[PDB]
């Protein structure tokens, strides 16, 4: 359950550190334009 909980953290903490990938390498396209 703790070792489930520890699974679910490391693996949202995957998704976000992905989304924050996307958002940075868009900001560096966005910072292109301006």
């Amino acid at each position: 359950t703790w070792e489930x909980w520890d699974x679910a953290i490391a693996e949202y903490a995957x998704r976000i550190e992905x989304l924050i990938x996307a958002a940075q390498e868009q900001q560096e396209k966005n910072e292109x334009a301006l």
Binding site: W2, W5, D6, A8, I9, Y12, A13, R15, I16, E17, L19, I20, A22, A23, Q24, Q26, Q27, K29, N30, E31, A33, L34
Partner: protein, 198 residues
Amino acid sequence: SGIVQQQNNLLRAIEAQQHLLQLTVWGIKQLQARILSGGSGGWMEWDREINNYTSLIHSLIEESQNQQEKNEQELLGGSGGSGIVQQQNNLLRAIEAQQHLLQLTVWGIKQLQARILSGGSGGWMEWDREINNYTSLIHSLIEESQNQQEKNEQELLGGSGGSGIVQQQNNLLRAIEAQQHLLQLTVWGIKQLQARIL
């Protein structure tokens, strides 16, 4: 307007982090069961205030998803730029609400650690500095984002597009990055505590 897409990623991050926050509240409540009664030290109010900001963040995420859809329906028609700024305001607000939540969980962990571990360990003295730092870094970025939002809004009068909107996008990004670090610190501390008891 790669922006509208980026906003979606930013909002998705904020949802990801909210799930993550909620798993830490779960961890604290378990630990707290074992270390305390509840009716003292400001713990009834903690419980009540996690619930108040959780509700708040749920509404902001709902409100933000709706604005997002609206913006997606409006990429071709023009008469946009207003929804984009509205949305920036919505994400900023979500970030602030989540900051109120991290501060709460942070307080919870300090209270628990105080009772069962020596704060002096090198691991916990770094933690305390990192928490103080990331917290200052976050308030600074929020302060700065607030200043930019007002600037962006005032300049939407006759602006005809702006780097103000792009600067703001950066701001919100960097705030979320900082919250993630703070989020990692709070997960470390629960792990130390849990190893000590459970």
